[PDB]
Amino acid sequence: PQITLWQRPIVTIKVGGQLREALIDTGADDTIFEEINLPGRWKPKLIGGIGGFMKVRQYDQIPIEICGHQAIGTVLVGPTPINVIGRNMLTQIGCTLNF
Amino acid sequence: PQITLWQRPIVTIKVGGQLREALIDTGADDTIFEEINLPGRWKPKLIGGIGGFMKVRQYDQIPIEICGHQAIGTVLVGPTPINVIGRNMLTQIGCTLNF
């Protein structure tokens, strides 16, 4: 759909067989969830934001459904304050900015 | 214009008489710049992100030009890794998400 920005642009997602809410985040290169349980092998990764860096687990080739749209890609798991859908997934569902 | 997300959605802004580049950031409630010199009174503020909290100066009712569009609002100044235009300004210029 079209989403205005008067409120946080939060959408419902399905990942790893679990349901979560996440922020559509154009300022995020990558996609980050707190407290999901994904299968398989992962790589430790350090990522930087406001306030410094945080350690995450990097999982590759993870299917995700984002407001009804299917995608597959890297998902980072770590102690983010809010789950974020970043550009690596937003490009797959055709998300654009308009003004 | 329309902006796709294959690259970071960086735009040119004018604020405090200075020219900067900034990321259009739908995941940001507020607007944050590193190293700009704004006039007048400010109040200290702590804000949270990935990796923890950071101290910023909060300046209110600051005029800003964002890719040619005029707005006025709160601008935070502090050691962010990249300048971000958040929803407090994006709503003023009519920015929306589309997919």
Ligand SMILES: CC(C)CN(C[C@@H](O)[C@H](Cc1ccccc1)NC(=O)O[C@H]1[C@H]2CO[C@H]3OC[C@@H]1[C@H]3C2)S(=O)(=O)c1ccc2nc(NC3CC3)sc2c1
């Ligand atoms: C900082 C920004 C440049 C990047 N971020 C995305 C932002 O959209 C972030 C989302 C968020 C919201 C809430 C809490 C935590 C985070 N927003 C934020 O921190 O906003 C803050 C402050 C601003 O106003 C209020 O609104 C929310 C609060 C609050 C005060 S990220 O998460 O660090 C981030 C995300 C993905 C990512 N991928 C990388 N890959 C590597 C490169 C190859 S690096 C990387 C960094």
